[PDB]
Amino acid sequence: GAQVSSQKVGAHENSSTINYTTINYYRDSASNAASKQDFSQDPSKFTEPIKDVLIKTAPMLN
Amino acid sequence: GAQVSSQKVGAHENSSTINYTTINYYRDSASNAASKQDFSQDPSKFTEPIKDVLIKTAPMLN
Amino acid sequence: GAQVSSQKVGAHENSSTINYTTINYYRDSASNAASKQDFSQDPSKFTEPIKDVLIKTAPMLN
Amino acid sequence: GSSSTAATSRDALPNTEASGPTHSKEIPALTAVETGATNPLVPSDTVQTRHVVQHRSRSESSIESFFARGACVTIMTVDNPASTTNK
Amino acid sequence: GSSSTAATSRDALPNTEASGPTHSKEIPALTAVETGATNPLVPSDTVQTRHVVQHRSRSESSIESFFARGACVTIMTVDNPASTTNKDKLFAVWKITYKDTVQLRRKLEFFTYSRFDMELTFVVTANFTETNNGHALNQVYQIMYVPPGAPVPEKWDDYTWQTSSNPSIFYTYGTAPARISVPYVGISNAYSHFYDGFSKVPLKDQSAALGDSLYGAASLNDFGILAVRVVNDHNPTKVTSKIRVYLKPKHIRVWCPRPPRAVAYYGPGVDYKDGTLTPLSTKDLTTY
Amino acid sequence: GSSSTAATSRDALPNTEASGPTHSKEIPALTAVETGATNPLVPSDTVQTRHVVQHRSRSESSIESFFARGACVTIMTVDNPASTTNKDKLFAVWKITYKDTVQLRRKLEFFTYSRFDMELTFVVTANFTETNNGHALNQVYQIMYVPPGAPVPEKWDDYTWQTSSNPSIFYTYGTAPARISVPYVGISNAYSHFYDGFSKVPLKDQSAALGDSLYGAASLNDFGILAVRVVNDHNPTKVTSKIRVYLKPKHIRVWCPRPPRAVAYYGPGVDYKDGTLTPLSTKDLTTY
Amino acid sequence: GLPVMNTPGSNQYLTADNFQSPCALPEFDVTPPIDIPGEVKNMMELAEIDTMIPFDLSATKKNTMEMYRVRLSDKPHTDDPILCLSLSPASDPRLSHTMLGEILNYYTHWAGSLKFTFLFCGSMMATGKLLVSYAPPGADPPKKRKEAMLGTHVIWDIGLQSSCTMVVPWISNTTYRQTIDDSFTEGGYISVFYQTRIVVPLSTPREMDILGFVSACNDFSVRLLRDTTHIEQKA
Amino acid sequence: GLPVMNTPGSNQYLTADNFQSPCALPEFDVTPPIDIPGEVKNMMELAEIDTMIPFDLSATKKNTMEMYRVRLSDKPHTDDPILCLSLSPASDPRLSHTMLGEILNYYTHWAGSLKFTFLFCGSMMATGKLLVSYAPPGADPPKKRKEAMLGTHVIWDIGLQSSCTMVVPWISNTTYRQTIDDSFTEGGYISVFYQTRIVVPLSTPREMDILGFVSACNDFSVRLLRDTTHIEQKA
Amino acid sequence: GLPVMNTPGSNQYLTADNFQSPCALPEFDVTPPIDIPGEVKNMMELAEIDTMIPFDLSATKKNTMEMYRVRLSDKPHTDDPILCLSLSPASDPRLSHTMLGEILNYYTHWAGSLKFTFLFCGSMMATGKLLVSYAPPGADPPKKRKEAMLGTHVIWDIGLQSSCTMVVPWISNTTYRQTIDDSFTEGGYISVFYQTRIVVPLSTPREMDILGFVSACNDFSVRLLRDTTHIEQKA
Amino acid sequence: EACGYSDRVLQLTLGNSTITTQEAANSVVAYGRWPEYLRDSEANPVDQPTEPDVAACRFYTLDTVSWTKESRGWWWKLPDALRDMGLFGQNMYYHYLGRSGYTVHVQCNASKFHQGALGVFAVPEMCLAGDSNTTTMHTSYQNANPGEKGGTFTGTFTPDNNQTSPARRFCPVDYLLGNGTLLGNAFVFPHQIINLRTNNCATLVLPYVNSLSIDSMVKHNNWGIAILPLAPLNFASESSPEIPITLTIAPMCCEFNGLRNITLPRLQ
Numbered sequence A, B, C: 001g002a003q004v005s006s007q008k009v010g011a012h013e014n015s016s017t018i019n020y021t022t023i024n025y026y027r028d029s030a031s032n033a034a035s036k037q038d039f040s041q042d043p044s045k046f047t048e049p050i051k052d053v054l055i056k057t058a059p060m061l062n
Numbered sequence D: 001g002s003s004s005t006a007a008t009s010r011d012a013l014p015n016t017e018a019s020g021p022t023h024s025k026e027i028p029a030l031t032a033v034e035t036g037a038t039n040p041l042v043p044s045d046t047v048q049t050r051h052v053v054q055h056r057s058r059s060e061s062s063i064e065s066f067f068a069r070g071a072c073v074t075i076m077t078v079d080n081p082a083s084t085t086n087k
Numbered sequence E, F: 001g002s003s004s005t006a007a008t009s010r011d012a013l014p015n016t017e018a019s020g021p022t023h024s025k026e027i028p029a030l031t032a033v034e035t036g037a038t039n040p041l042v043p044s045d046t047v048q049t050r051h052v053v054q055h056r057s058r059s060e061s062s063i064e065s066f067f068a069r070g071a072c073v074t075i076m077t078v079d080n081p082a083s084t085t086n087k088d089k090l091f092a093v094w095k096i097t098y099k100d101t102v103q104l105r106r107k108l109e110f111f112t113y114s115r116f117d118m119e120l121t122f123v124v125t126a127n128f129t130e131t132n133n134g135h136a137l138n139q140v141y142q143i144m145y146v147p148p149g150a151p152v153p154e155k156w157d158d159y160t161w162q163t164s165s166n167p168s169i170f171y172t173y174g175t176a177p178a179r180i181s182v183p184y185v186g187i188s189n190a191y192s193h194f195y196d197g198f199s200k201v202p203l204k205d206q207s208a209a210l211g212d213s214l215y216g217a218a219s220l221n222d223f224g225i226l227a228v229r230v231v232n233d234h235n236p237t238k239v240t241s242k243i244r245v246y247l248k249p250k251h252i253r254v255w256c257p258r259p260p261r262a263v264a265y266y267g268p269g270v271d272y273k274d275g276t277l278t279p280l281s282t283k284d285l286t287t288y
Numbered sequence G, H, I: 001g002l003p004v005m006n007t008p009g010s011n012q013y014l015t016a017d018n019f020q021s022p023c024a025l026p027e028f029d030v031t032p033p034i035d036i037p038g039e040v041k042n043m044m045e046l047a048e049i050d051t052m053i054p055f056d057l058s059a060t061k062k063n064t065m066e067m068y069r070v071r072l073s074d075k076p077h078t079d080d081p082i083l084c085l086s087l088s089p090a091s092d093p094r095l096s097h098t099m100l101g102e103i104l105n106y107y108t109h110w111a112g113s114l115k116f117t118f119l120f121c122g123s124m125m126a127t128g129k130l131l132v133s134y135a136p137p138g139a140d141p142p143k144k145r146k147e148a149m150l151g152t153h154v155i156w157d158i159g160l161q162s163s164c165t166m167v168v169p170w171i172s173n174t175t176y177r178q179t180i181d182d183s184f185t186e187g188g189y190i191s192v193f194y195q196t197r198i199v200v201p202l203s204t205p206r207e208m209d210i211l212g213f214v215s216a217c218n219d220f221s222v223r224l225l226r227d228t229t230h231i232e233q234k235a
Numbered sequence J: 001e002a003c004g005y006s007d008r009v010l011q012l013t014l015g016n017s018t019i020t021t022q023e024a025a026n027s028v029v030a031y032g033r034w035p036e037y038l039r040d041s042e043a044n045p046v047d048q049p050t051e052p053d054v055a056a057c058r059f060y061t062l063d064t065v066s067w068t069k070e071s072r073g074w075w076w077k078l079p080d081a082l083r084d085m086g087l088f089g090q091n092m093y094y095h096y097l098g099r100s101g102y103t104v105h106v107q108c109n110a111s112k113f114h115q116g117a118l119g120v121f122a123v124p125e126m127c128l129a130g131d132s133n134t135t136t137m138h139t140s141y142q143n144a145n146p147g148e149k150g151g152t153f154t155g156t157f158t159p160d161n162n163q164t165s166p167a168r169r170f171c172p173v174d175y176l177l178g179n180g181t182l183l184g185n186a187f188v189f190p191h192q193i194i195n196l197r198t199n200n201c202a203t204l205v206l207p208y209v210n211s212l213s214i215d216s217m218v219k220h221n222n223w224g225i226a227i228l229p230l231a232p233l234n235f236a237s238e239s240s241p242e243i244p245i246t247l248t249i250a251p252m253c254c255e256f257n258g259l260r261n262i263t264l265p266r267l268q
């Protein structure tokens, strides 16, 4: 049941992808650690909540 | 001898089924933890212990 | 996710290559130990930084 | 090696089905407790219901889950006095 | 066996593209904030830019990353006096919440609704109170979780501490700080950082005092309480202990963003208090 | 599953080759250091050599190997007095750096620029100060990391210790020395062991005192500070503790080599002080 | 020895934890199980079984065989209530001690549809039509047939079929309700009335008793296990 | 028992650590999630939203609805500044408390391009041409159009399109800047001027207000999470 | 819980140990590396670079620009030494402080071939022939050309090629030598003499200086890392 | 459209009501989510819901307020503001539970010679600050819910000092959004700006927002409509000008559960 993943490597030694192994000991999801393998989304719903899609090169008001 | 199972996942992170690994260290069943992988049954033997099966849409007494 | 490598063996017992097993527990590279599997380079950039490559058998100045 | 893994204690309870009006000879609401039995009725039998996808579970109310907790059954008292004490 | 492993929180931000001069009918710089929208502009739209390969990431600013830290929500005080003392053995009762302290509360409050598995870590420290010299054997604490409805303890040693059903943590002094995980336990589909309403509806036909209730307050007892005590019997020499509770929100999700708390917190609600309403400092319009 | 495993740091150095007599126009021994280069000569170039199979390695002299050792960078002093004492409970505040001590600093300074993941190990020792006889329960230390900009603690017990966002280590006395890892956190592409310049540009048109700044000093606050305290409440009998911080540079890289510090360090910069400028000892030109 | 590093929670005792442990009686010849009748797999199964309600908890009737009997009579039609009851399964004195109420008090949260069945213990010669009502929270608790008639209800007609079942549908704002009296998670009102009036011939008893039973529908569940107040050990 | 050897860090509590731990409420029926509107995945998303700037933080205007209003007038052309501002997003009093500045104070380092949008709240009959400037550090902070004109700027012409956006490009020596006032990581100067002059007809207000907004460009990011000074608990 | 048994070394702190550990700054956006010139991979690389030797460490010349200058003259032929030096790279005052000597003092053991290069800083009109010698330990340290001539040496002829390199071959009984003065691991003697004599014409300086440099050959290595005495912190 | 169509000119139609506008700055849809009925997968209350449709899902025009040099701002709460509006209020009071979205149309016209900017904001769970410094969360149900006439913001925080007989009401200070946070940041919330020189009004389409699929409309207010003067009203030279701000709102895809006798609240 071992879950193997990739570490986004910062400062590399004078020493190919590096990995880290994770295994869940408990039956309850809540007991589990944070994956940190999270997703980004486009701000649109907040920065441009307007009915009629807007084109930056053209006049906002027309 | 490793026993791999599925965690019924509650509150999911902004991060496909998640699993948990279990291994038995002792020779005696009693030493083992509780699986919690249990079964439900129909209350019938208690809520309807009557000889002649009953149909809810029809008159209980006929 | 286990990383198996070779130990450069020094003083051998009256007892074929010997190996050592390594596994990364953390998601962050920084958390990881030092591989010590490092590389050497030729001193040239410091011992012979001269524009015109030099041949030891011949006159340095010509 | 690795071994991976009918109604489960943690399975979602039965979904509520959409139910309309009724003018029939069928009498679910009417019964006779004298027989020793309990009327298997559900909301849709006595009132007009909408369709509902049920997510709730009886996981925590299972025999194991109900008792799956360490409980205090006794408090034992012992001691270690000075050699001299008479007691 | 082994299971190995669209835009990721840790993916490199968009590269800056080479941009030359412009003499056109296209007007990116010009707009109208009145519409409710924010101009999606980028350096290359208003100035001549060079080509730049972007390596920077928003990894650390993600919802989980932003809260992925153990925060102190309360300090519980308990004790174990000499049998003789006239005053009662002091056992602690704390109503669980993130509002007793300000730091974590302000962070969670950047948003209206939230959802998450809760990780509680307990740091226990003890000490001697009297210029005495007698000692005390290693203490064992009992942290009992009492959910709304269950018999709340009235004595450091009454029947309730049996915890037949309630979850209890038996911590041993000097050992690695205690820790337990808790699922998303809300009676709602998500925790409400804010409730613009009441738990009761004041009915005309019914006496004023009866239909009354607190503003912005839902379940009089959201999540029950934490009842802590020192299991050890009364000791000749009195020893006072403190239990620091660290709360960390994991596997977390948040909805509907809000402007951060600008002025000193004043109670469990949004209420502000006189003399604290002037946050900003003096700085002239034309001074760098 | 299992992943198994050009010139390696631990590869055997070049074998010495058998060399006979010479009567030629080739002049290896002769050269011209003026060019800036060093004669790549080897024993076989100036003398008759035998064949030798070389087993020796430069493994231990590699950049990582050279620094692969925990070095003491500072000693923090904190305490926990009797409630009554008139003087304040002493909590420590240390500005993070490798220059407070000399050993590790001299090694890092063999080079202009550096890059590396940092491993901090904390050795904590405590003791009694007064010819008293009273005792004290096991102490729990709180090592809080306060980055530049964050509210620096003013009291052993003020609001800042909540560490809602800042990283804190809760160490328990008598237990294996605390340890944490830190990535390459520099605002630059590499740490600068030396900065031949200033943080400010003195502008004519502007008052002298304003444009002034320290020589060789960049960010007034490079990496913030380490704020340490004893979490336990004031104890009748006073106990003084010391926190020794061991710093080890891992996954390290270095650029542009330099001549080692030949004379006694005098402050955070390259400054030397009178009376310490005569390192070398007396030894005659013609004496073995 | 394999390099290990101890983490928070180490050496602690979580009464609710779930781990393995050494067996004090190794190789012990365990006595096999026999197919014993009446086996239960889930506490909810017991909640689904009809249990008699102690409706008349009045000063003199309470804690006696009488609290179970709701008395009716051949008296003239009145829009006034035969019996008023709050939908607080675990907290309301009349429901809190029934098989259902009792199991509910071992848990912090409850959800789903309940069903109330009423048994007419009067004589065969006795006819009548009653109105069983359920009024979801938020308004003036029904004190007259008029108001009660306006919400979820069932017009029970007395005859051969001794009993009548009224299903109290799962109607709530929150996904779960609290096993205690709480304005926010309130369930509403259950009331009973005379649709027409209990009619009886001569030589027959003008007064009779009606028994009432409560049980949980298959959509019913509970969560957050907890210690109950229905039992204690003062000393 | 398997031979193990404890290493440094053992039994310690790292507030920032990330490990597993026993669940106090085993098998607990968790309430599912509902598709709630307005969900956020990254703090930076909030920084990309336009937020009003408290420009006029003067003794009497500060901490009042007025600090947000930058007043202009039909007065004669002058090369003098309408408003001077330092590029210190997290430390500068006028930026530190804006949605962007506030999020920045939870972090030690900031990087990328910012964008300043100005809204002309004067009458439709009122015309004018303003000069919005950005001057990268290292020189005499602009006090006259002449100097400001020499650096990164935008000549805003007032008309139908109510607002004008000036993008402050990511121009720095270090890969990241400090969320505090620091000579070494200084951002430069943002200043505004009268290109020509606000002109208005008769029967029209010779004085009007212009609102200003700041937000982060898609190339913007922050790092090294930290506790902010914008809130406290003295006691 | 998995049965484990703690072994000796448990909970101890080995300053030289090499294990994993929790990261205080999770998910931290690390600033990438730029191709910076002059990167070093091994301390030995620095030892292979020619560094000037402080030969004349006499009472008055030491700790001054002069200690580096070995003075010669147009004087008559003499079998007497221009300069005597012991092969103790790390311990001998004249070698101990050179780039090579300095790195050697961070290590307990040294091995391999060294090379001594001499630069003639006299005038172009000045001719001469010098004898650079190396005498492996075990005998009377050379005090006269006669004896020095009998061991490993190089007859340097002064001309266009300003400098002359003499390679001191790895000649030892033990696989490694100690970075300190030690009879058992002694390296021998390095001495310099007048083969013929420095000759110069009229109108030319009869006295000139010769600079000397030391560096390590590719067969050179060091081991057993250790703290040096070349720097301290009394207080 | 080369054919004529434009951002400034719109026509909204719900049930028997239609709104037209020749000077609009487009329209905003809160969090990009258009109002919708409760899905089966997300549903809670099992009973057949009551969906009034056109009878309630139409445009109600509240009492017109007056904007002046002195005005500090106005506030309303949903559904509270519509509680007395025809068939929508009737259905809201007859049912235990109810959920609804809204199309908020704020009308405010003037002249090419007038100045000023109205900041129109839609705030989820708009909890406001009370008038008391000796006690907290004490604002009475009657005062927290003004109904159609709504409430107003104050440029200054003046504490209720009558400990004996407390006003038990809100003290919402303008620059602090009436809730402890800086107004300058209110823009992170679904909104539009009514800039006299650019547009007649503001149109906000609000979805049903909440920690629950459906809730108590009488006990709880889902949305808060805040209108503050970002830039003060100003005209030609008149020292005390004035212009009306008319607020028209329409419930959407709204539905109700738990039917019983009508709820008669103690609103005074």
Ligand SMILES: CCCCCCCCCCCCC/C=C/[C@@H](O)[C@@H](N)CO
Residues within 6 Å of the ligand: E096, E097, E098, E118, E120, E143, E144, E145, E167, E168, E169, E180, E182, E185, E186, E190, E191, E192, E193, E222, E223, H024
């Ligand atoms: C032995 C230890 C057991 C610990 C038991 C903890 C269970 C209770 C956790 C409740 C979580 C509350 C988190 C904050 C919720 C608030 O925001 C609410 N007012 C919002 O809905």
Ligand SMILES: CCCCCCCCCCCCC/C=C/[C@@H](O)[C@@H](N)CO
Residues within 6 Å of the ligand: F096, F097, F098, F118, F120, F143, F144, F145, F167, F168, F169, F180, F182, F185, F186, F190, F191, F192, F193, F222, F223, I024
């Ligand atoms: C709970 C413990 C957290 C520990 C936090 C440590 C983070 C700060 C580490 C800073 C690293 C500084 C290393 C030396 C850099 C100097 O050489 C600079 N002057 C050169 O750029």
Ligand SMILES: *C(=O)CCCCCCCCCCCCC
Residues within 6 Å of the ligand: A001, A002, A023, A024, A025, A026, B002, B004, B021, B022, B023, D002, E001, E002
């Ligand atoms: C999937 O996990 C199969 C591989 C198992 C690897 C060995 C597991 C190491 C110890 C796990 C026991 C789980 C603890 C409850």
Ligand SMILES: *C(=O)CCCCCCCCCCCCC
Residues within 6 Å of the ligand: B001, B002, B023, B024, B025, B026, D001, D002, I003
């Ligand atoms: C089936 O278990 C084969 C896989 C074994 C995985 C490694 C087991 C981890 C340690 C177990 C030893 C048992 C302790 C008595």
Ligand SMILES: *C(=O)CCCCCCCCCCCCC
Residues within 6 Å of the ligand: A002, A004, A021, A022, A023, C001, C002, C023, C024, C025, C026, E002, F001, F002
């Ligand atoms: C790749 O690792 C698959 C093989 C896994 C071997 C068992 C791992 C031993 C315990 C690892 C758990 C990781 C600790 C976070």
